[PDB]
Design a protein around this ligand. Structure first.
Ligand SMILES: *[C@@H]1O[C@H](CO)[C@@H](O)[C@H](O)[C@H]1NC(C)=O
Ligand SMILES: *[C@@H]1O[C@H](CO)[C@@H](O)[C@H](O)[C@H]1NC(C)=O
Ligand SMILES: *[C@@H]1O[C@H](CO)[C@@H](O)[C@H](O)[C@H]1NC(C)=O
Ligand SMILES: *[C@@H]1O[C@H](CO)[C@@H](O)[C@H](O)[C@H]1NC(C)=O
Ligand SMILES: *[C@@H]1O[C@H](CO)[C@@H](O)[C@H](O)[C@H]1NC(C)=O
Ligand SMILES: *[C@@H]1O[C@H](CO)[C@@H](O)[C@H](O)[C@H]1NC(C)=O
Lengths: 49, 49, 476, 468
């Protein structure tokens, strides 16, 4: 849902004739964890990472 | 790992498509951390988003 | 004797009380609440369009305002009869609505030279010193040309953010929907709400001849300089043709009698100043009659002022194709209501002077009177720490919680904490470390350590008073 | 010597109490509650039509009412909720005439009609529209078998313009369509009554339904409803024989109690009414006599109700039974409450209970004295709130609403979100001063009074008993 999110609201907000004061381009610094995990049992979780 | 999201609409959307169809946020992908900035000249305040 | 002085003052006060209560019953009718409720539901609580779900009180953008103006607004103002418009087939829309805009000018603020390249223009916050006064857009009509406050018969408003003026760029809508829609479309086409606008008012009024009772309506959305929209509303059911029925004559007679009673109280209170003791203000029962007299005189003056200037109604009735300017009467009505309510409260409080008919009431009165000084002494130490907590909450959480957004909000939130109303589900995320500490420490030190001192003082004083009056009787 | 007498009154009272409790447990079954809830879900909660989202609880216009009377009403009245209708439904209208105002001379040329609030002195009596039978001709209250209602806005008469619907959907819909084609609901109509009766032989429980939609003088619609289930069989099992025996036993007990009361009042010609236990018995016997009279009145007229399962065509006027059936519950509840309260007379012989009762007894004069001082301030605050917020908050819309809202504030059930926006000054001032003067000052006097009286009573009792 992040891609539609940036598609409909974020991109019009960052650039355009409105909301001119920006003061710098955005970033997408993401972290990896190096430890690709299989999907967890769906439903109520133990709430512990 | 960080991206720059471009500077104009066309380049921003092109970069988004390019990284989406080349398996960027498809793996383990712990977190994304989108954060940019803002400035407000009427009052003289900033905001870290 | 002494029985002919405490009983005459009782009978001359019960008549005053019944006259005041008759007037109070006369003011607040039961046909008023539903009128306002239906109007409010019609205008605020309907979606702007069949697709969206944003009603007036949930506007979030300037583009939603244009959906409201040509939308749920015109859908409520103009109704087809089963030409004039009857809003519920009962309430007559008299005159034509007016829409007015307040705007500032580019360059009212200064952008720093370091980043002057990326910022092109800036608009300051609203202030009369920095208010635009020049024509803009297609300079054809009166919606694009500044008009002074004296030429609009306007006045300030004291909105949520600022205190707006009464002058601006106004446009009078039409009597029929097929023309008002065209006017609003023309306004939207040539951009009329640009980035420089600061407020926008909509005003109109209705009659509802079934019960003789006007109702003035004002709708305000204000766009702060930091973005967003803040809507507001006001519905006031006036009454300007009062002398119609017999009950109106009875109420007029009651007002005349009330004026005579106030004159009598003035003379019978000034008789006990120079003819008798002077500077006898350490009583609290003569410092309260002056308050009642002053408030009653102010209420009489306000009523005379607000009923002696009714020329707006006759002026509108002479030519019934213009905007009826009833926004001034709806202000004095509010002020009169507030003053009358406070005066009634104090008159009712004054009843405590005349309940000492036996020992079991004199004991309670003495207990209340003897512990007033101690309670006042402790209340200062209580409220100093109370205000310290309030200011701490205001400085820490006062940016991201809303409940502590201003000092008054902090005070009321703390009172509601004492009541046990609000819970700390939202304080914690505002500050992880000082979220729970503030809540738990405030509850601990203001719910059963400093809140029990009032109970201790009152219980101890009551026990002491009862013991003393019992020992006084033990020598007969 | 008095111990045997105390045991005699104790055993008689215990027999009376157990008989009363079994009789009241016998008159509260679990079918009535579920039946009322299902009936309400069938007639109210269902939407008017599959293309609309407004049910009966959310009427907002006359056209919505006309849609409802052709939609959910007919759907749930002749169902595919397994109940069966008896008789025929009736729909009634109350309206005023085209003048009440001395409309102001200033704008008399712009407005031509008045229809003021409903009042019996301002009710229309002329025929209107296509004069045809009952729907367009005035029918007096006496000839219409009706009575007052006491709705939400005002109190409505029993007269009006009525029409009796039919037993099958196919022509009841035609009748409603005919009433809609002509303008049967003008600007002058002030209320509209719809009512009927159902049986539901599956569970033996009659039900009487009233649906009132009233149009105030300022436009809009205020709906209201009333569902009251009934049971008029009283013979299904020998358990009802036990209930009949219990009722006869209760009648004998009340006869014995009034005999004892008249004896005890002939012993004490006067001054007998200053004990609170010689006065409570009078209330018990009076309320019991009233309850027995109401019960016999309500069980005498049952023969009318039974002879309506024969599929006839007439309106069954059951509004009278559904009113006494409620008054009987209201009287029986208070009787049970006071009988339970009267138990304190007997367990007050234990020394600790005697001390607690003495503490209540010797501080009742101070508590009542301070209650006047409390309630003067309470009423002053309530009237101030009524005058300030009385048109915008819906919790202070009327005086008793202000009273109950303040009582709820005492418990800590305030919202304060709409009090402040109603009035930004005198809104917070009222709230803060009320909270301060009630929680910090006034509510502690009760505690002080009770604590001091208890302590001195205990000291006196111990000192007096120590002389032995
Ligand atoms: C307002 O003035 C600034 C210069 O102070 C200018 O750059 C800007 O274009 C002006 N705005 C408009 C709408 O012309
Ligand atoms: C002003 O409004 C009129 C309305 O017909 C139209 O000519 C145009 O939109 C505006 N400008 C001028 C010069 O009239
Ligand atoms: C202001 O009031 C005067 C009457 O004193 C009236 O003639 C004038 O039209 C009013 N102003 C407007 C903009 O209508
Ligand atoms: C109502 O009465 C007024 C005058 O009494 C009359 O002019 C008007 O036509 C009447 N309207 C109806 C619908 O009867
Ligand atoms: C009224 O009654 C007459 C005769 O009974 C009938 O002809 C007429 O159709 C009726 N009116 C309506 C609206 O059906
Ligand atoms: C109303 O009047 C009397 C009431 O006793 C009765 O004879 C009649 O049947 C009742 N019902 C009507 C007239 O529909």
């Amino acid at each position: 849902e992040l891609w539609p999110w940036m598609a409909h609201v974020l991109l019009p907000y960052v650039h355009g004739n409105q909301s001119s004061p920006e003061l710098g381009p955005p970033r997408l610094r993401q972290v990896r964890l190096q430890e690709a995990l299989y999907p967890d049992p769906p439903g109520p979780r133990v709430h512990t990472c | 790992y960080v991206q720059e999201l471009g500077l104009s609409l066309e380049e921003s959307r092109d970069r988004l498509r390019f990284l989406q169809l080349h398996n960027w946020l498809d793996n383990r992908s712990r977190a994304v951390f989108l954060e940019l900035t803002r400035y407000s000249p009427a009052v003289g305040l900033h905001a870290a988003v | 004797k002494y029985l002919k002085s405490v009983l005459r003052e009782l009978v001359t006060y019960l008549l005053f009380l019944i006259v005041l209560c008759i007037l109070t019953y006369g003011m607040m009718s039961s046909n008023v609440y539903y009128y306002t409720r239906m109007m409010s539901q019609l205008f605020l609580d309907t979606p702007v369009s069949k697709t969206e779900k944003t009603n007036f009180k949930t506007l979030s953008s300037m583009e939603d305002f244009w959906k409201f103006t040509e939308g749920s607004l015109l859908d409520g103002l103009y109704w087809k009869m089963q030409n004039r418009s009857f809003i519920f087939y009962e309430n007559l829309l008299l005159g034509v609505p007016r829409i007015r805009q307040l705007r500032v000018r580019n360059g009212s603020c200064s952008i720093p030279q370091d980043l002057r390249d990326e910022i092109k223009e800036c608009y300051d916050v609203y202030s009369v010193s920095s208010e635009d006064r020049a024509p803009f857009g297609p300079r054809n009509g009166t919606a694009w040309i500044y008009t002074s406050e004296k030429d609009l018969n306007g006045s300030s408003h004291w909105g949520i953010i600022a205190t707006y003026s009464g002058a601006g760029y106004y446009l009078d809508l039409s009597r029929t929907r097929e023309e008002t829609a065209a006017q609003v479309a023309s306004l939207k086409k040539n951009v009329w709400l640009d980035r420089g606008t600061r407020a926008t008012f909509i005003d109109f009024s209705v009659y509802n001849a079934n019960i003789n009772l006007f109702c003035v309506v004002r709708l305000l959305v204000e766009f702060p300089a930091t973005g967003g929209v803040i809507p507001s509303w006001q519905f006031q059911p006036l009454k300007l043709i009062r002398y119609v029925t017999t009950f109106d004559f009875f109420l007029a007679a009651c007002e005349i009698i009330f004026c005579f009673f106030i004159f009598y109280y003035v003379v019978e209170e000034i008789l006990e100043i120079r003819i008798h003791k002077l500077h006898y203000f350490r009583s609290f029962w003569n410092c309260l009659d002056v308050v009642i007299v002053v408030l009653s005189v102010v209420a009489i003056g306000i009523n005379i002022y607000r009923t002696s200037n009714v020329e707006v109604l006759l002026q509108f009735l002479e030519d019934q194709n213009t905007f009826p300017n009833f926004e001034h009467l709806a202000y004095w009505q509010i002020q009169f209501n507030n003053i009358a309510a406070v005066t009634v409260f104090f008159v009712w409080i004054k009843l405590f002077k005349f309940i000492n008919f036996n020992r079991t009431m004199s004991q309670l009165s003495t207990t209340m009177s003897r512990c007033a000084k101690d309670l006042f002494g402790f209340a200062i130490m209580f409220f100093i720490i109370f205000l310290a907590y309030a200011q701490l909450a205001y400085l820490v959480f006062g940016t991201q919680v809303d409940d502590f957004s201003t000092f008054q909000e902090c005070i009321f939130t703390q009172f509601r904490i004492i009541l046990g109303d609000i819970n700390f589900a939202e304080i914690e995320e505002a500050n992880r470390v000082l979220g729970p500490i503030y809540f738990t420490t405030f509850v601990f030190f203001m719910f059963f350590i400093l809140l029990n001192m009032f109970l201790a003082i009152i219980n101890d004083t009551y026990s002491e008073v009862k013991s003393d009056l019992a020992q006084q009787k033990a020598e007969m």
